[PDB]
Design a protein around this ligand. Structure first.
Ligand code: NAG
Lengths: 55, 171
């Protein structure tokens, strides 16, 4: 069924890459390749707040 | 209360005595006025201060986020998470409610105890040199100047000194 005028779909995927590891992409089509990645370092566990309260 | 002094045999309190929680009111030939007993007041202050701190500061928590996010095919563990959050809410509400209920009773008794004990320290000094006229007052059987007053409060009232004069006034 059309969702935003799209009879098709597109799944999104994600994974982490350890310091000093390799990741390999390989496809004959239908691949939405990455353009930007993010070098991150996650600290202690936190949450997400959903509120109209201003900052 | 339990000790039966505050709202008991001492009907009301004194809005004039502003030095502390417990004290005396005297009148003699050379004046009158209020004066708080700091020895018992400080003990209550030091004791109550330690009590409020013990409830506040025995509560120590670590950093935590309660917000967990579950999609539409995880309603089971979303209701589990709700059972945990609602479970802690029920416990901490019942504990805090009952604690303040119970310790407010204990604190009001603690002030009743201090007034009772402060009264007995005076009674056991003026054994029969003064008259227990009720309402937590003593009427002396002798002339007690401001020097004599400061000795009853100090706890150094000289019974054998005034026993001579109080014997004949009892008639
Ligand atoms: C009060 O009691 C103390 C107890 O040691 C005593 O030394 C003192 O002489 C008494 N009188 C006054 C006025 O402090």
């Amino acid at each position: 069924p059309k969702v935003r005028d799209q009879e098709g779909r597109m799944n999104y995927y994600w994974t982490l890459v350890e310091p000093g590891d390799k990741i390999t992409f390989e496809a004959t089509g239908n691949l939405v390749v990455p353009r930007y990645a993010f070098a991150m370092e996650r600290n202690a566990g936190s949450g997400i707040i959903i509120s109209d309260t201003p900052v | 209360g339990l000790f039966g002094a505050i709202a008991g045999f001492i009907e009301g309190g004194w809005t004039g005595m502003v030095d502390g929680w417990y004290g005396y009111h005297h009148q003699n030939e050379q004046g009158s006025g209020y004066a708080a007993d700091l020895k018992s007041t400080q003990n209550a202050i030091d004791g109550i201060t330690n009590k409020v701190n013990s409830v506040i500061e025995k509560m120590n928590t670590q950093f935590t986020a309660v917000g967990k996010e579950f999609n539409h095919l995880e309603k089971r563990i979303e209701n589990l998470n709700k059972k945990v959050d609602d479970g802690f809410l029920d416990i901490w509400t019942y504990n805090a409610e009952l604690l303040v209920l119970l310790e407010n009773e204990r604190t009001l008794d603690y002030h009743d105890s201090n007034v009772k004990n402060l009264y007995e320290k005076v009674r056991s000094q003026l054994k029969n040199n003064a008259k227990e006229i009720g309402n937590g007052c003593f009427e002396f059987y002798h002339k007690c100047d401001n020097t004599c007053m400061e000795s009853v409060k100090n706890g150094t009232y000289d019974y054998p000194k005034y026993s001579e004069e109080a014997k004949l006034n009892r008639e």
